[PDB]
Ligand binder design. Structure first.
Ligand SMILES: *[C@@H]1O[C@H](CO)[C@@H](O[C@@H]2O[C@H](CO)[C@@H](O[C@@H]3O[C@H](CO[C@H]4O[C@H](CO[C@H]5O[C@H](CO)[C@@H](O)[C@H](O)[C@@H]5O[C@H]5O[C@H](CO)[C@@H](O)[C@H](O)[C@@H]5O)[C@@H](O)[C@H](O[C@H]5O[C@H](CO)[C@@H](O)[C@H](O)[C@@H]5O)[C@@H]4O)[C@@H](O)[C@H](O)[C@@H]3O)[C@H](O)[C@H]2NC(C)=O)[C@H](O)[C@H]1NC(C)=O
Ligand SMILES: OC[C@H]1O[C@@H](OC[C@H]2O[C@@H](O[C@@H]3[C@@H](O)[C@H](O[C@@H]4[C@@H](O)[C@H](O)O[C@H](CO)[C@H]4O)O[C@H](CO)[C@H]3O)[C@H](O)[C@@H](O)[C@@H]2O)[C@H](O)[C@@H](O)[C@@H]1O
Ligand SMILES: OC[C@H]1O[C@@H](O[C@@H]2[C@@H](O)[C@H](O[C@@H]3[C@@H](O)[C@H](O)O[C@H](CO)[C@H]3O)O[C@H](CO)[C@H]2O)[C@H](O)[C@@H](O)[C@@H]1O
Length: 298
């Protein structure tokens, strides 16, 4: 349960240790993922002092036949297996249509190298969801020790419309406008051969483990209390469903999840997701990540 610092990324460090993925959105969102040079020129990525900002374009009214709203998807150059990743996050994207995520996967063999969604939601709908998406023969037990609430317990992407096996965080301030009003917080994910765990601690938590909040070079997860989400190996060989994964942080719009009319309008958002995203640039001023650091331990 003891790990030691492997990477400590702050501010401009992200520009040399991650790349921007200028790809068509795998989730079919109303987005134009720009490359690193484009992001920096357009100030969609800003990386200086103790701050990384990743944001959507909030000035352009989109041509409906042209590409989607400019945004970014950054990916660590390094990959990881058994490790702990800690994200010190001051702000996450908000706004109707938004679908931000901080997560890990192996894109090159998806879903067979696994996927763990650490921070994720849509359309400002708290709470946070933590979810695995895998190949066949990977499920979760109905009862296991965690503070969050399991929804779906089958992780296999070819089941249930690829909901994955998810857990909802117990507090509103785990996600969205609630999280942002509270100044964010910390997300930590420990992955071993035997399990994946995620902890969320709000910015104002009186009980955030010092390991998580201060980022010393040595940590011990035994001292961290019960995880928010727990994915044991009872009904899933975790180690055989996950391989070496990159860390990804992104913001898309609409698409497979956020763009479903029932979900978008269910969230109180007007009209169609694509129309809204095209025509309301100012509504995306607060569609930004503000990240203080990301640390990895091995
Ligand atoms: C590209 O896009 C970027 C990013 O959006 C644009 O950058 C912004 O530029 C604008 C205009 O120039 C800046 O706006 C001004 O900011 C003034 C204040 O700046 C200083 O304070 C900011 C707030 O700091 C506090 O909060 C944060 C947490 O959010 C703490 O980390 C920090 O320590 C401070 O904590 C104190 O206050 C809180 C309460 O709020 C307490 O709880 C604490 O205990 C503390 O008492 C801060 O964000 C700024 O940091 C930036 O700059 C420093 C270098 O000085 C760097 O180290 C950081 O990494 C970061 O980059 C700064 O210290 C404000 O008074 C004024 O009214 C105005 O709003 C804005 O700060 C920029 N945002 C950044 C840099 O993140 C940029 O303009 C654009 N570029 C182009 C080319 O267009
Ligand atoms: O549990 C919270 C929340 O999860 C939502 O799902 C999130 C994931 O949504 C994914 O897209 C899916 C699509 O994959 C799915 O289409 C399937 C096809 O991909 C596949 O080829 O064929 C089958 C039919 O055999 C399709 O079902 O369609 C659903 C919508 O019906 C999409 O949501 C994203 O790719 C993935 O990144 C997300 O994790 C649920 O949609 C939501 O209901 C639930 O509340
Ligand atoms: O063409 C066949 C089929 O494609 C479908 O879409 C999926 C994508 O949803 C999927 O997206 C993955 C993400 O959900 C996950 O979060 O990240 C990974 C890594 O970036 C993505 O690959 O990608 C797969 C494989 O390319 C696609 O098949 C449509 O949903 C489906 O309707 C269509 O028939």
């Amino acid at each position: 349960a003891t790990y030691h610092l492997e990477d400590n990324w702050v501010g401009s460090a992200f520009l040399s240790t991650f790349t921007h993925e200028a790809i068509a959105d795998p989730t079919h969102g109303r987005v134009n993922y720009v490359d690193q040079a484009t992001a920096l020129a357009k100030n969609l990525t800003y990386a200086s002092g103790d701050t990384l900002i990743l944001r959507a374009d909030h000035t352009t009214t989109l041509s409906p036949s042209g590409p989607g709203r400019n945004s970014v998807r950054i990916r660590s150059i390094k990959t990881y297996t058994t490790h702990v990743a800690v994200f010190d996050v001051r702000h996450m994207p908000q706004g109707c249509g938004t679908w931000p995520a901080a997560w890990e996967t192996d894109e090159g063999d998806w879903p067979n190298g696994g996927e763990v969604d650490i921070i994720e939601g849509v359309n400002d709908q708290s709470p946070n969801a933590m979810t695995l998406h895998t190949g066949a023969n990977c499920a979760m037990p109905a009862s296991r020790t965690m503070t969050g609430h399991a929804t779906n317990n089958n992780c296999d992407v070819n089941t249930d419309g690829n909901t994955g096996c998810g857990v909802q965080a117990p507090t509103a301030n785990s996600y969205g406008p609630s999280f942002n009003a509270n100044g964010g917080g910390w997300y930590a994910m420990e992955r071993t051969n035997s399990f994946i765990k995620v902890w969320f601690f709000p910015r104002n938590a009186g009980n955030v483990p010092n390991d998580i909040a201060s980022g010393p070079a040595t940590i011990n997860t035994d001292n961290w209390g019960t995880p928010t989400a727990f994915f044991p190996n009872t009904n899933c060989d975790i180690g055989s469903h996950f391989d070496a994964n990159n860390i990804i942080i992104n913001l898309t719009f609409c698409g497979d999840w956020a763009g479903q009319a029932s979900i978008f309008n269910g969230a109180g958002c007007p009209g169609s997701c694509v129309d809204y995203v095209n025509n309301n640039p100012s509504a995306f001023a607060n569609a930004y990540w503000d990240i203080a650091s990301v640390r990895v331990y091995q």
